[PDB]
Paper text:
During HR, a recombinase binds to single-stranded DNA (ssDNA) and forms a right-handed helical nucleoprotein filament, known as a presynaptic filament, which then searches double-stranded DNA (dsDNA) for homology.
We next solved the structure of the postsynaptic filaments of [name]-[name] with homologous dsDNA (Structure 4, 3.20 Å). The results suggest that the [name] mutant still binds DNA for filament formation but the bound DNA is too flexible to be observed by cryo-EM, likely due to the unfavorable replacement of a polar glutamine with a hydrophobic methionine. These results suggest that the lineage-specific Gln244 coordinates with the conserved Arg242 to stabilize the backbone of DNA in [name], which is weakened in [name]-[name], leading to enhanced DNA dynamics and loss of DNA density. The Loop 1 reciprocal mutants [name]-Qm and [name]-Mq changed in opposite directions to 77% and 87%, respectively. As shown in the other panels in Fig. 4f, both [name]-Qm and [name]-PvGd mutants displayed similar properties to WT [name], whereas the reciprocal [name] mutants as well as the triple mutant [name]-MqVpDg behaved similar to WT [name].
Numbering used by the authors:
A (entry chain A), B (entry chain B), C (entry chain C): 22 to 272, 284 to 337
């Protein structure tokens, strides 16, 4: 899987070290990057930059699978529960494993509360044979109170050391620091193979919208979101991890980011408020599920019924 | 912390004094600042703008902390009491130290009275080992009667010189003067390290709403509030100070500013009137605390029971 | 104070006379005015609009005063008596000098009678070293009977020429004529420096309600009250004059204007009727004084005991 099986095909050891310096840590990463981007590194000319693909084509089929064989391949996709059974019923088992899930709401609809339950409920063996692993959290506003996890660790009856130890945390201060933080996401996913299960960005555009205030330069923000919306989709397919992002709204309402975020998101969940601690969850833009509604109440312990 | 430790890591003295000219005085202040805001200072170009960042990369980890190590880091967050124990119980210890707290009410619900007690009660050693320091006050309507402090200095039994000397005052006349006044906030926070504890803006939108009309030019204000709502969040994290702002209402009521202020605020407290001098305080949009209520009295001495 | 002191700091005579053409006649008047309101005068563009502000920056500190130094600065605030000692005791010395005071009542509670005493009692040297000066009156219904002053001039034992000569009068016919009348208020305040002490608008909303209907176009008024409620607060701070407005009521009662007037008013006095010629005065929304009551009488001579 890693860049070590290419040595027994023709590729020398002087190119392997330079290949891992750019970011490529997997064999699927060589087939996910174009030749133009591979020729932007000093030490590998076109002649030698095309020879690595020849050895990368004899490892995996560049062919056409039958759709019956593809359903056998799509049984490694897991599903992470939310904490409430009516809401998992809405998403069709929970949060998908090779996709990007978005949630947007007004201001108190429970977007940080949904992300705090997933830091606990994804370390627990649930349905479909899902074993449970560690969790990366990237927070952009400030809202990662770790004492809130010790409320949700009690209703699942797990100890507080093993639930505060499998969560890794890093705050991005700006959108460039949000960009450079995904290098350490891949470097942590690769050296610990298969014991990371999801990745949370607390908000993708708390830092994007603020930097580019001007209307005139707005277009570039759409070639810089498009960097990390496909960077994020490629990370979820090499390492088979879920991706959960949350979004804010603007003013009679619609989320921020427009059509690029709405296209690149596989599943969007709208969140609005009911009486007291009840909230409503509708489905926008899902490939399988229809537009239905549910009801989750924010309790001491996060999402419930 | 401050910028002399870059000098031993490859940066000459020739470019430090221009980084102190825009406003950056902290190692974290370069991590808060983009590579975009670092190019429009005249005299720093592209192959030399980068080497400050990678020499800032050796002072700090750009890594991923475990959440158990983050709880060890979040013991520098203090809590400032309000003046009444039932109301501190509602907020969970008082006013948080790395966040933005908002309070809105109708017209006599006690928003200026709550801000006048915090100019006295934050100079007093309270719970959690909070030592007590000085206070910045930015007032936008007119309501900073300093003789009201000499009513609240008596119920805590402190002398009147030491309670009128640790409060700094400046009135913003317009929203641009509100913007340029935060430069002197950082320049005062930096030369007196650690002996400033909070920052009060008496109202954020007494001046924002007036200059503009209605939907004629709605956009210019939501990218100009978004400047000083993240300017204010960044100041609270470099220097570890609390931020307390108050808000007005409009007409069956909801505050002014909409979703940008409602998103950027970590904690909102609604205030409404009871019989006589009793008021009610509900919680809107908190990351830890649930929606409860409490009663406080506006006595001679500010907030009481 | 006035605009000749900018001439010695780099500004030619060519651009002073156009700043005196929009209405700005004071060094503080440039600090009250944005860089936005300074561009729509034709003949002043972007690289030259800025240098007035930074040359206004050397006349004053843009800094932070200690609150002990601010109490030394707030001894130029005077207090004008009402005519009765029990009612001055309620307001804490009388009518404040850098604020907006509102009085509302049912229909015969004595709002015009209170305004007729202040045209006499403010020309008399009272408490706190208040010397006494001239008075601007803006009337909106019709009720400025000048023979009523010659009843109140007798109980203070002053002659009738010197009490009918220091009162200037102008009736606004509509709310736009109410708006354009504040230009002559500033032009009269500036050429006679320090010998004007208050400003009375007989009712702010006798004219702001006739022009607009119901809910169909409610907004065009809020954005237009908010013009002259901050226009009026800015006039009171450049020239240090009191502002007294009166308000009407509607139907179990509350005044007209809602939350914008209730926020922008520093002190509100409710007025209701007792037996015969006794009235009651309660305090709504004061920054210093508590909610108390004080009966006053409407005699031949206005307000008494
Ligand atoms: N411990 C708790 N118990 C019960 N309710 C809580 C608790 N903590 C927070 N809440 C409620 O959860 C809501 C806040 O949820 P939250 O996920 O923070 O929304 P949010 O979308 O992140 N707000 P924002 O980031 O500004 O958009 C509020 O209604 C709180 O009252
Ligand atoms: N010294 C005092 N003792 C008792 N009550 C007081 C005192 N000073 C003010 N009050 C009361 O406090 C209330 C005013 O509180 P305040 O905090 O100024 O409200 P506010 O929201 O700032 N008004 P506004 O700025 O126009 O929206 C009124 O009911 C006053 O009667
Ligand atoms: N010379 C006087 N001597 C005694 N009482 C008087 C005299 N002139 C007027 N009054 C009384 O004072 C009151 C006048 O009320 P006024 O000052 O007009 O309040 P008002 O609220 O402005 N009325 P309105 O303008 O219709 O809302 C009435 O009760 C009169 O009877
Ligand atoms: Ca949140
Ligand atoms: Ca106030
Ligand atoms: Ca009248």
């Amino acid at each position: 899987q890693d860049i070590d099986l290419l040595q027994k095909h023709g590729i020398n050891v002087a190119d392997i070290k330079k290949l891992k310096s750019v970011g490529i840590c997997t064999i699927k990463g060589i087939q996910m990057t174009t030749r133009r981007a591979l020729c932007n590194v000093k030490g590998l000319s076109e002649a030698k930059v095309d020879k690595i693909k020849e050895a990368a084509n004899k490892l995996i089929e560049p062919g056409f699978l039958t759709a019956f064989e593809y359903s056998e391949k799509r049984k490694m996709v897991f599903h992470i529960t939310t904490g409430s059974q009516e809401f998992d019923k809405l998403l069709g088992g929970g949060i998908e494993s090779m996709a990007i899930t978005e949630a947007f709401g007004e201001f108190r609809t429970g977007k940080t509360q949904l992300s705090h339950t997933l830091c606990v409920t994804a370390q627990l063996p649930g349905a479909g044979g899902y074993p449970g692993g560690k969790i990366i959290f990237i927070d952009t506003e400030n809202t990662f109170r770790p004492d809130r996890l010790r409320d949700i660790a009690d209703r699942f009856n797990v100890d507080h050391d093993a639930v505060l130890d499998n969560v890794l945390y890093a705050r991005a201060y700006t959108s460039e620091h949000q960009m450079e933080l995904l290098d350490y996401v891949a470097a942590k996913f690769h050296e610990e193979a298969g014991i990371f299960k999801l990745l949370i960005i607390d908000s993708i555009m708390a830092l994007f919208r603020v930097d580019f205030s001007g209307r005139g330069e707005l277009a570039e923000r759409q070639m810089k979101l498009a960097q990390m919306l496909s960077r994020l989709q490629k990370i979820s397919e090499e390492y088979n991890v879920a991706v959960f992002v949350t979004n804010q709204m603007t003013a009679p309402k619609k989320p921020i980011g427009g059509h690029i975020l709405a296209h690149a998101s596989t599943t969007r969940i709208s969140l609005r408020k009911g009486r007291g601690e009840l909230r409503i969850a509708k489905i926008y833009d899902s490939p399988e599920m229809p537009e239905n509604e549910a009801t989750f109440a924010i309790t001491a312990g996060g999402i419930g019924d």
